[PDB]
Nucleic acid binder design. Structure first.
Ligand SMILES: Nc1ncnc2c1ncn2[C@@H]1O[C@H](COP(=O)(O)OP(=O)(O)O)[C@@H](O)[C@H]1O
Ligand SMILES: Nc1ncnc2c1ncn2[C@@H]1O[C@H](COP(=O)(O)OP(=O)(O)O)[C@@H](O)[C@H]1O
Ligand SMILES: [Zn+2]
Ligand SMILES: [Zn+2]
Ligand SMILES: [Zn+2]
Ligand SMILES: [Zn+2]
Lengths: 797, 797
DNA sequence: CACATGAAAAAAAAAATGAAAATGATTTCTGA
DNA sequence: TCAGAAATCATTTTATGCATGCATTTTTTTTTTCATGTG
């Protein structure tokens, strides 16, 4: 039999013909610098091949999915299994989905109800009758979805004073169909008996109601039967995602009036299945059980007393649900509720849910690849996560974990360290062993950090906090928060930590950040349930930095986004050759017709279509991917063309441009963040989320913040090596020293150990928390016995 | 670790709470009668569950997947693995697909040709450069397809002597758009210079060419691109296949003029890629290699000479390709080319190709379930199959094979026998052991056959061959055949045998079948390549029986197809209650408005739609699925209703209707074929190929043959137990006794030893075949030592 | 040799079916 | 005097919608004949 996984000729991305041998059915941990190719090897070439060699064998669909899937550049790979990837980018927005269905616990719940449900109104019951995704179970009106769509009145009609013929409403003034919309509302004017030019404000209330409801009958070759009607047929006739989001933006959601939002047929509620007993006490229904927390659900299902004969059938189902819920608890999601919609889950929660359902499914002989699983997970639960991972490995499953947590190491049977360098000089394997020679290795950065040879030190002096200038939020009651008031210091670095589910995301993202956005930047976000936010006068604008791409088009790259490519172009025009040939600074851009080529249109890669194949990309025969015409390229600034300057890495860019302080400051900041490897020409869509947030904060560090703005950060250590964490801390401290305020949500022990202010939320996640357990400097927060974060901080300071 | 597979609560179809325990990483063989539940237990509830469990974790889809797969009715399944099914329905139809691409051998062959592709007389070479599925390799002309579609101007026009005014060309008469067609072709006649009313033959040849090729004139102000161009754009603009193969049916495929079939660019093809060697002499390019047989290509690859530097890099590539081709040979596809299109492959060939690809991939932990694999495989290769099969068992996988071949058993680690009967009274488990208890099991039919307790008995007397009246094909030289002449005796059962790929199917299904059909039934099929067929006048018609379903609509039924339902309805109308109520026979049809439920329109179920969900069917609420209104159902002929009669099984109905010989004959024939389990009202599309085959046989048994018809059958033993084979043999004997001739292409030695004439084809398949090695009684061929069939016949006759 | 039943087709009948949004480039005036 | 925020104009990409349909095509259903026994 085969007990070793052997790869040879992995030439993909920055890897240089990397070959490796791994022990099958063992815990393997990948380590390396961000962008060193660790994720390229673990996900893009190993997982892709393991998945492709399986799905290509599937007879159904007559064709492999994802446009012939993809083919990693491997020479010879053997010892694989079917490959399953668990990463945050697997989240989805399917309305019918819930954590009950995703982890399949809902199906066993339905089986238990079918075999063990009593009507109890003062036998014809099947599991399909409890499924809200089945005609036998759904709410008749809500179609099994516990929501209903109601159009936002003020959003669709922001200006009621303009004439109706203008049609300033978005559906009436968008695209070539705006004139057609004018056609049908002009026809409806005579069809219903109202003026086609009267503004909404000047229109009678009944006229606007009749516009809302619409009319009938064929009027003039076309039909119009209401605003709700044509919008509904519009998302039933979608072609563009932009129209999707534009029209769903004002699509308000209300609980189903008949099913009370429980997305179930009213008869199939406790009216049919009140047979459940005990728990906290009394009976329960399927909707009520789904609405419980996971811990509460498991506790209730443990103590139910449904009767002996009924138990003879229900015992195995109860044991199965018990094991699934035990898995979910072990992963650390006791605050979640089985009825929670899939759309309301963060990336870390989605990853943890996926891992829990995988360990519950019982699949054996499967190769798992996992992104950083501890993201969004507090340290106090990390150990319990590891015991889960090994448990999965105990089912005969090979594990590959791309994790930089120290505790996950010293536990993996095998460690592979890549990245004797960051980018072009980091695509080599530097270690492959049982963690022992890692601490002995010399050129292994991860080994240096783990051994204690190199470490992030606690700064001696913490920035002083001034109580006079603080940003205080009072009356925060959204979700789990218990009506508390919290004071964020201004001008310093403050971090808010706590167990998952405590309420840091609610307290920061959809309460404080929304208020700051719509009161400083003039946004329109819903500010959640809060009473007051005081201290805003000290600031001028808020910026929140996330993983969203800096640009959705190939026309955007870090050079343009940072606002440095414009200076490069002006320098190129300033070159004597460009001056004598009369070249404007704009021409040197790949977005204006002056400098591009007529085939690429500046894109570089043209499209090619086949009869039965998805489109493929191939460089233009003129530019050879240079995105510029020959006349543009023949201009030399310091002996180099525009293309070479464009495609060079950030490091050699900083080595370049030395006499020009302007661009050099930006390039130096980018290097300081840790983006030296990225080429200036790298398309924005290709950049990862971590690199996106890093370049965002880099560009923000430079433009004279003058100590007035505030910055909001989600977990910024996601997918970051220790050295990357050190760089990001340096940049954050540099930003704070300008006088601004930086608030970050993070579980990393180092970042919160080097912060100025610390806010610890909640004794536990979910209903057990939502308060503030300790706040102050890291030193005195480590002295609070009630804080788990303080407990972990005690031994690090 | 887990080393067992456990299933509790299997309930698909006739399976009743099946509990199963199997050893993992072993060879497990499922046995039972046809339709006894083996297919449900293997494919519908084990493979389906495993594949669904794997793909549900995949993030490629938006959880829609391949139409949500299905949810098998199983209480619990433990120890599963990602399941891959090697089934007959894996017929890939993609024109890009070829046997090279299916088995990935083409990939490594491209890799080798890149690593060692010396430019010959006339380094800038990449693996993708050789692929016809990429623009770097496919030619501009045919886009790497090898063919281009056209049509001759004769087959598309059925009535050349008839005017083109009202649609002389076949597509012109379809739909009300015939007036449109007349309008543009009359506009074309206005300026081009032909007449609307002039028929095809009277039309000037210039007009004939110009209407097909188009003209540069504005006709109905719109330029005309041509008949062929117009139809091509019609097919490219339509996605409904069922209505469009009626137009692409009459196209003819012509090789690409520049590609000359080989679907690569000429520069990459052979101009600079002819740097191989050969055991015989000379060098060959990739097209020649892909054109070779598998054995020729393999043993040529054993003889490559390139130089030490090239060997140092190509050693592993050669090793992998050699191993893959060795697997392919061992499965038994020696005759097969490496460039054969996936469309032309038969079911067995594709199944064995998938098996070879699976063993070549080296995936570990996969749960492979395999339908009957030995179909299309001669017995002499069968042993070599098992050794290949065990190889996968020794790759760390688990094998489940539904089988009845004696040699495949006695090698399986585990054998499970299910379904003592094929009906509702059959689905169960009767044995689960290592072939030892099976031969000792008294109630197991499979064990009874294996132990020799009862078996197919050799006929005492073979029906005499009449030399005067034989159907002789002379000049049959298609494919590997060499102009041989074959004599089929008339009025006796003959079986064509031989090694796989001997040319039997091209002889019978291609040469003889097409000639017989176009000379007796009036079809227009291409008769293959031969010189003459004589002895034809002794026949009157040809009846070919295959697995194609008897109608694709739910209105179809076994009773309706066989015609028994008309007599049933007339009998129901003949009842006193129907007479006094004035009910016509049609009142008992679920296809007219008289008696069917109008809500159902007779189908007995309704379709319910919700957003984000696929189609669901639920029984009609007033019909209760009975498909008829209450008054029609009020008739109580012999105490039973029409729907009640439809629910009765064929055997139960045969017990019923006994006094009515007109229907009792049909029911008795159906029972004797072995269809006693299929209920009368079973919808036609829900019957698999076996039921269609056997029902067609039953119907043709009672067609008043008068001894002048000829039946040709492909392998009928496909998925048949020994007892089912015996029943089919009895039916075939009855059919022959009427004076008809039955020709069967069968590798199953049972029907060979029961046959009355045997024709053995080819010493070895492929280029070594095309000859006649023996013909006559089974004793006569068994006497010949050069016949592989005779060698196995020696021990049975 | 009438004849009733059982078959052979044929026609018939009907059920599908076919210009806004949204990052970059440009200019200004604005501050240090 | 010179380097930047901020507003503005381009691209470039925008979703341009309607209403049929009267013929075929494919099954079943119904009928008329039509040998072939049959007593
Ligand atoms: N979109 C939502 N829908 C329903 N409940 C939510 C939602 N967001 C948060 N909650 C609840 O509010 C509580 C606070 O959780 P949250 O603040 O998201 O945790 P964290 O701060 O670790 O992200 C949780 O117990 C959760 O159950
Ligand atoms: N479409 C085709 N293209 C090329 N060669 C073919 C094709 N069809 C058949 N052949 C050749 O003719 C032979 C036909 O053998 P076949 O009748 O399939 O034997 P069997 O029925 O036992 O498989 C094959 O060996 C193959 O080499
Ligand atoms: Zn509802
Ligand atoms: Zn170009
Ligand atoms: Zn070609
Ligand atoms: Zn009905």
């Amino acid at each position: 039999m085969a007990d070793r996984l052997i790869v040879k000729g992995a030439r993909e991305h920055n890897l240089r013909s990397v070959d490796l041998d791994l022990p099958r059915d063992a815990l393997i941990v990948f380590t390396g610098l961000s962008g060193s190719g660790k994720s390229s090897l673990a996900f893009d070439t190993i997982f892709a091949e393991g998945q492709r060699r399986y799905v290509e064998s599937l007879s159904a669909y007559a064709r492999q999915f994802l446009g012939q899937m993809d083919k990693p550049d491997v020479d010879f790979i053997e010892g694989l299994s079917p490959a399953v990837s668990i990463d945050q980018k697997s989240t989805n927005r399917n309305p019918r989905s819930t954590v009950g269905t995703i982890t399949e616990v809902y199906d066993y719940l339905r089986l238990l109800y079918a075999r063990a449900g009593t009507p109890h109104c003062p036998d014809d019951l099947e599991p399909r009758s409890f499924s809200f995704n089945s005609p036998y179970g759904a709410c008749p009106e809500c179609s099994g979805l516990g929501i209903r769509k109601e159009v936002d009145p003020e959003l669709v009609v922001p200006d009621p004073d303009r004439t109706l013929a203008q049609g300033a409403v978005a559906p009436w003034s968008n695209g070539h169909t705006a004139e057609y919309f004018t056609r049908m509302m002009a026809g409806l004017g005579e069809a219903l008996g109202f003026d086609v030019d009267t503004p909404w404000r000047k229109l009678p209330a009944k006229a606007r109601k009749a516009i809302l409801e619409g009319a009938d009958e064929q009027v003039h070759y076309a039909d119009f039967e209401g605003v709700l009607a044509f919008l509904q047929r519009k998302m039933s006739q979608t072609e563009s995602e932009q129209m999707k989001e534009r029209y769903e933006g004002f699509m308000r959601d209300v609980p189903c009036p008949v099913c009370a939002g429980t997305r179930l047929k009213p008869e199939i509620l406790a009216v049919t299945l009140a047979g459940e007993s005990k728990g906290e006490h009394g009976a329960k229904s399927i909707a009520e059980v789904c609405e419980l927390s996971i811990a509460d659900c498991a506790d209730f299902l443990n103590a139910l007393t449904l009767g002996p004969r009924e138990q003879a059938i229900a015992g195995q189902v109860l044991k199965e649900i018990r094991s699934r819920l035990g898995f979910l608890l072990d992963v650390g999601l006791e605050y979640l509720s089985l009825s929670r919609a899939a759309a309301t889950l963060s990336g870390g929660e989605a990853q943890r849910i996926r891992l829990a359902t995988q360990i519950g499914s019982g699949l054996v002989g499967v190769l798992y690849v996992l992104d950083e699983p501890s993201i969004g997970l507090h340290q106090r639960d990390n150990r319990r996560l590891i015991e889960t991972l090994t448990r999965l490995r105990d089912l005969g499953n090979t594990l590959i974990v791309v994790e930089h947590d120290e505790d996950t190491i010293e536990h993996a049977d095998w460690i592979v360290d890549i990245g004797p360098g960051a980018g072009e000089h980091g695509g080599r394997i530097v270690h492959s062993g049982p963690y022992d020679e890692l601490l002995r290795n010399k050129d292994s950065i991860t080994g240096a950090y783990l051994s204690g040879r190199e470490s992030i030190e606690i700064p001696a002096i913490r920035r002083s906090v001034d109580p006079r200038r603080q940003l205080t939020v009072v009356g925060a009651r959204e979700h789990n928060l218990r009506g508390i008031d919290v004071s964020f210091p201004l001008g310093v670095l403050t971090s808010v930590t706590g167990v998952s589910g405590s309420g840091k995301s609610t307290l920061v993202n959809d309460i404080l950040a929304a208020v700051l956005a719509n009161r400083l930047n003039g946004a329109r976000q819903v500010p959640g349930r809060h009473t007051r936010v005081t201290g805003l006068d000290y600031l001028d604008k808020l910026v929140r930095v996330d993983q969203s791409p800096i640009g959705r088009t190939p026309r955007s790259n870090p050079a343009t986004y940072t606002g440095v490519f414009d200076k490069i172009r002006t320098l190129f025009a300033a070159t004597t050759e460009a001056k004598v040939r009369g070249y404007q600074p704009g021409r040197f851009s790949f977005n204006v017709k002056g400098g591009r080529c007529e085939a690429c249109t500046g894109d570089g890669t043209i499209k090619i279509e086949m009869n039965f194949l998805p489109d493929v990309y191939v460089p233009c025969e003129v530019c050879q991917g240079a995105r510029y015409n020959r006349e543009t390229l023949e201009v030399h600034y310091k002996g180099k063309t525009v293309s070479e300057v464009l495609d060079m890495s950030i490091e050699e860019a900083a080595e370049f441009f030395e006499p020009i302080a302007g661009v050099h400051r930006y390039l130096r900041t980018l290097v300081d963040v840790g983006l030296g490897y990225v080429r200036l020409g790298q398309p924005a869509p290709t950049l990862s989320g971590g690199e996106a947030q890093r370049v965002k904060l880099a560009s923000e560090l430079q433009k004279r913040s003058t100590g007035r703005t505030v910055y909001i950060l989600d977990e910024p250590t996601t997918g970051l090596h220790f050295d990357d964490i050190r760089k990001l801390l340096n940049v954050i401290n540099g930003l704070v020293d300008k006088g601004n305020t930086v608030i970050v949500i993070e579980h990393n022990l180092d970042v919160i150990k080097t912060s100025d202010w610390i806010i610890d939320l909640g004794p536990e996640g979910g209903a057990g928390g939502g308060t503030v357990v300790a706040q102050g400097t890291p030193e005195d927060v480590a002295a609070v016995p009630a804080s788990y974060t303080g407990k972990f901080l005690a031994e690090v300071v």
